[PDB]
Design a protein around this motif. Structure first.
Motif, short mmCIF file in Angstrom:
data_model
loop_
_atom_site.label_atom_id
_atom_site.label_comp_id
_atom_site.label_asym_id
_atom_site.label_seq_id
_atom_site.Cartn_x
_atom_site.Cartn_y
_atom_site.Cartn_z
N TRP A 1 -0.97 9.24 5.05
CA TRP A 1 -0.43 10.10 3.99
C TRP A 1 0.64 10.98 4.62
O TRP A 1 0.45 11.61 5.65
N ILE B 1 0.83 -1.20 0.00
CA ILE B 1 0.00 0.00 0.00
C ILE B 1 0.87 1.25 0.00
O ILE B 1 1.75 1.42 0.84
N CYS C 1 -4.37 6.06 -3.35
CA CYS C 1 -3.91 4.83 -2.69
C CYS C 1 -3.71 3.76 -3.77
O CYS C 1 -4.67 3.41 -4.46
N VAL D 1 -11.06 -1.21 0.78
CA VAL D 1 -10.08 -0.10 0.69
C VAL D 1 -10.86 1.20 0.85
O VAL D 1 -11.79 1.47 0.09
N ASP D 2 -10.47 1.95 1.86
CA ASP D 2 -11.04 3.29 2.11
C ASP D 2 -9.98 4.35 2.22
O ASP D 2 -8.88 4.12 2.71
N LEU D 3 -10.32 5.53 1.73
CA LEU D 3 -9.62 6.77 2.13
C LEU D 3 -10.26 7.33 3.40
O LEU D 3 -11.46 7.34 3.53
N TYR E 1 -6.97 3.81 -6.24
CA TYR E 1 -8.14 4.37 -5.60
C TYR E 1 -7.84 5.81 -5.25
O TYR E 1 -6.97 6.08 -4.43
N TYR E 2 -8.52 6.72 -5.93
CA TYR E 2 -8.13 8.15 -5.85
C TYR E 2 -9.24 9.11 -6.10
O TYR E 2 -10.18 8.81 -6.82
N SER F 1 -11.71 4.29 -8.97
CA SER F 1 -11.33 2.99 -8.42
C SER F 1 -11.04 2.03 -9.55
O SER F 1 -11.97 1.43 -10.10
N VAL G 1 0.53 5.56 -0.43
CA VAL G 1 -0.39 6.72 -0.31
C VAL G 1 0.40 7.96 -0.71
O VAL G 1 1.50 8.20 -0.22
N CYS H 1 -5.08 5.74 4.27
CA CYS H 1 -5.69 4.65 3.53
C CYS H 1 -5.81 3.46 4.46
O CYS H 1 -4.82 3.11 5.10
#
Length: 100
Positions: free
Chosen positions: A96, A8, A26, A38-40, A67-68, A53, A10, A81
């Motif tokens: 981050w 991972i 991410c 997967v979450d921000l 994922y952004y 995504s 970030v 992330c």
């Protein structure tokens, strides 16, 4: 069967077309099996609106997820992330680095 825990990363990027728009990313890479969450996070709370995504796989059947979404950071706000996968006994949180 094979299982591989994701890497991972970030980071933030501006698209060259639009230097006025900053994006939080991410990149969750090299994982197997494909099931994943997967979450921000912004100040520890899940970000609902994530515009992009993008999922792919390689020949060796590893999966890759970018994922952004657009963001406007300030000094006070913290971003991360959060990833859950079968290979992880707990959700993995990667902060981050605001310089990245």
């Amino acid at each position: 069967m094979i299982q591989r825990t994701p890497k991972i990363q970030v980071y933030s990027r501006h698209p060259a077309e639009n230097g006025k728009s900053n994006f939080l990313n991410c990149y969750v890479s090299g994982f197997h099996p494909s099931d994943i969450e997967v979450d921000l996070l912004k100040n520890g709370e899940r970000i609902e609106k994530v515009e992009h995504s993008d999922l792919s796989f390689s020949k060796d059947v590893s999966f890759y997820l970018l994922y952004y979404t657009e963001f406007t950071p300030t000094e006070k706000d913290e971003y991360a992330c959060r990833v859950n996968h079968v290979t992880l006994s707990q959700p993995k949180i990667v902060k981050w680095d605001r310089d990245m």
